[PDB]
Design a protein around this ligand. Structure first.
Ligand SMILES: Nc1ncnc2c1ncn2[C@@H]1O[C@H](CSCC[C@H](N)C(=O)O)[C@@H](O)[C@H]1O
Ligand SMILES: Nc1ncnc2c1ncn2[C@@H]1O[C@H](CSCC[C@H](N)C(=O)O)[C@@H](O)[C@H]1O
Lengths: 335, 335
């Protein structure tokens, strides 16, 4: 890398806020059905023309908008993630960044010096990460909606590559938006499906499963996997993308509680995005681990071997890495 | 054109940004100036906990800043990652951590109001430069990092422009003064002076005296907006990267005062980084305009024709563009 690469990356928060500010203004929706110049976009946004134009010029220069003779145009290929009404809209992630992650990363240096999250220094809030994240129903929605889209390729692969038919009942601990049990329901009518979630997420999840027609099919159980509050004859239990939100010590407490609640002969699968064997990457995972530092209660990313050892210390038999292609690593053990 | 994954990557780009500024502010790379060290050793040198130190080191390794296990600082990177080397990016990092990153947090409201966010982010309704220069350490931070930015422009300006044309030279807003210093090394007879704001002037006197130019470059406090400018035989006057820190209307005042101040037959040169002809790029310049929006008193980037119009309206004769080596466009006016 060059000196210029470093300067670009050091100032990469410029691009990041240009996009989140535009999404929050719903700037791109001003171009859903028409092309417009800056003066017209500003007037409809009820924003001064000069500063609206400054943002529009930046978004064109970044390549998200086209501009011909002062007329801005939204590329057809960008509509799916820039428009509010679209399934891949990034506005959910945008708000999560604006509300939580960008403020907390502002204090990264201190998080590293103390190995401590920055929720109190940044927010003046001593509550737990998920209590802070979940204080408003809209913040629960943003978080679960953007994670759900991120999880879609994993879920599709899991359902296509693992034989869920061999189990009678399946519990998804920390399912989030519930798109895994939903996909399992679409594929296997016979298996019982349940979710165990924290209270605020249970409430969002109940309303969403009900609206989408799964209210009779997927049982929602409030609980806490760290305190031991869990339902239950589940011969398959899954934990997706939750271990990394907690310190390794807590991950052992979570895994021991799950083991204890399992039925005999039960199977357990955790899915994570681990660091590579020599903990040299991948880059987004390495940076995610820093995100867990500043925001969560002890979270960190780990290697596959580290999850494997944790399964064995927690009491699981035949702990192993599932031989399954996809964006996650699946760690599996039995009771 | 761009994909959802590209947009996500750029929305999360504050990850890489803060990873680098945190690493610089912790002096992390300095612990690899002499030796290759593991995380636990680097962490003891830094007095940070090994866990979070390793988390940062893995991120830096995956971003390609470090090799590794023992971490190794690539030779090509020493120049800008080591704190006592002449291209150190640590000055930039402190300016980002103290001023730019927090103010970009409020970009949306800046755009909605066409107004800097100094008051809302800092609880301080003084001037940009008064807030920026509140503390001589932030003066040094600002002036030093800008100095590194200007070094290719300065080499090209001293290269492709003939300063022997001129008996005396006045640099308004010279900042760290490295342009007069370069003119001094190359043109032993020309009189050299600087007009700066009071706090920049205090830093400048110290910095020029330390470097051995204290008897060679006159430092004179003043205010180009108010018209408080020195008078000598300044047959060349320069204004480097200052117009874009103020509103067009205010640039008019600055240029009008400069014209009133120059001797007959004199030449004035403003050096800017203009937006292109249809104001659609380049990307860094377009985002710098937003940076000026969130921080300065009305600042914005402009096209070259926009600067030409201002030179003409302020009364300059023979207003023209000069193309030179380096990242800056020179706008020339005469009396
Ligand atoms: N102590 C706890 N008990 C139960 N659920 C918890 C928990 N701590 C966090 N969670 C839940 O774990 C989820 C992690 S986000 C992961 C979502 C989903 N499983 C996926 O694979 O994409 C969140 O929804 C959060 O509410
Ligand atoms: N009203 C004013 N009168 C004189 N100098 C001013 C001024 N307002 C801002 N400045 C100065 O303008 C400079 C802008 S930063 C530009 C630094 C340098 N000329 C370069 O080319 O890189 C700052 O040093 C600031 O102190």
């Amino acid at each position: 890398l060059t000196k210029q690469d470093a300067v670009n990356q050091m100032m990469g928060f410029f691009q990041a806020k240009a996009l989140t500010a535009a999404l929050a203004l719903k700037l791109f929706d001003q171009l859903r059905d028409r092309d417009a110049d800056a003066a017209h976009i500003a007037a409809r946004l009820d924003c001064p023309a000069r500063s609206t134009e400054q943002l529009l010029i930046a978004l064109r220069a970044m390549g998200y908008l086209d501009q011909r003779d002062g007329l801005y145009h939204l590329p057809a290929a960008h509509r799916a993630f820039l428009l509010s009404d679209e399934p891949q809209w990034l506005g959910w992630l945008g708000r999560h960044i604006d509300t939580f992650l960008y403020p907390l990363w502002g204090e990264l240096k201190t998080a590293v010096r103390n190995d401590a999250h920055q929720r109190r220094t940044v927010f003046g809030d001593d509550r737990s990460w998920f209590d802070i994240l979940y204080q408003n129903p809209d913040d629960v929605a943003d978080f679960q909606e953007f994670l759900g889209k991120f999880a879609a390729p994993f879920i599709a692969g899991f359902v296509r590559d693992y034989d869920f038919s061999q189990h009678r009942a399946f519990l998804d601990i920390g399912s989030g938006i519930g798109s895994l049990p939903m996909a399992i329901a679409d594929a296997y009518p016979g298996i019982a499906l349940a979710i165990c979630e924290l209270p605020q997420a249970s409430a969002f999840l109940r309303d969403k499963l009900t609206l989408q027609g799964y209210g009779e099919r997927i049982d929602v159980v409030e609980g806490d996997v760290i305190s031991g509050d869990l339902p239950g004859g589940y011969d398959l239990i899954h934990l997706g993308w939750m271990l990394h939100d907690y310190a390794p010590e807590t991950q052992l407490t979570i895994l021991r509680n799950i083991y204890r609640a399992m039925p005999a002969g039960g199977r357990f699968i955790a899915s994570e995005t681990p660091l590579n064997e020599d903990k040299s990457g991948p880059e987004f995972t390495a940076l995610l681990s820093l995100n867990m530092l500043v925001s969560t209660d002890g979270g960190i990313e780990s290697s596959a071997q580290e999850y494997l050892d944790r399964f064995r210390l927690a009491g699981f038999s035949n702990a192993r890495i599932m031989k399954i292609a996809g964006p996650r690593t699946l760690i599996v053990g039995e009771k």
